[PDB]
Amino acid sequence: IDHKSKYLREAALEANLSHPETTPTMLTCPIDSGFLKDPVITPEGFVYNKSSILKWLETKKEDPQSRKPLTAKDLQPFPELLIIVNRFVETQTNYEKLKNRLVQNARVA
C-alpha cells in the first residue's frame, strides 16, 4: 500500500474542507497536538514528527496509536507532506490578517 500517496490526498482534502482558521488533524502531531515540522511515516501509514516519535521509542518500542511493534528504522522521511503543511499555515496567517482588518474597519465605519 502506498501510504504516502494515501496520506497526502487525504490530508489535502481535509485541509481544503477545513476553514483557514481551523487546524486539520492530519497536519498535526498525533502525540503532541502541534503542526508537523519534520514528518516521518510508518509502515502502518501513521505520521509523526521525527523528534517526537523517537522520544517515544526510547521508552517503548511500539506505535503510540496501534501499540504494534515499531523501531526507528521503520521511520521513513516524509518531506512531501511539508508542502501541504506550509501552504495551510501561510494561508492561515494571511487570512487571520484579512479577517482582523475587515472586523476592525467595520467597528468604526
Swiss-Prot record:
Q: What is known of its domains?
A: U-box 1 is critical to the ubiquitin ligase activity, and U-box 2 mediates interaction with host target. The 25 C-terminal region may carry the signal responsible for translocation into the host cell.
Instruction: Look up and give the organism this protein is from.
Output: Legionella pneumophila (strain Paris)
Q: Where in the cell is it found?
A: Secreted; Host cell
The post-translation modification note in this UniProt entry reads: Ubiquitinated in the presence of host E1 ubiquitin-activating enzyme, E2 ubiquitin-conjugating enzyme and ubiquitin.
The entry's protein name is E3 ubiquitin-protein ligase LubX
Which section of the whole protein is represented?
A: 17 to 117 of 240
Which UniProt keywords are given for this protein, alphabetically ordered?
A: Repeat, Secreted, Transferase, Ubl conjugation, Ubl conjugation pathway, Virulence
Function, as annotated: Effector proteins function to alter host cell physiology and promote bacterial survival in host tissues. This protein is an E3 ubiquitin ligase that interferes with host's ubiquitination pathway.
Location of the U-box domain: 22-95
Instruction: Cite a GO CC annotation.
Output: host cell
Q: Name one GO biological process term.
A: protein polyubiquitination
- Please classify the protein's predominant subcellular localization into one broad category: secreted
GO molecular function list:
protein-folding chaperone binding; ubiquitin protein ligase activity; ubiquitin-protein transferase activity
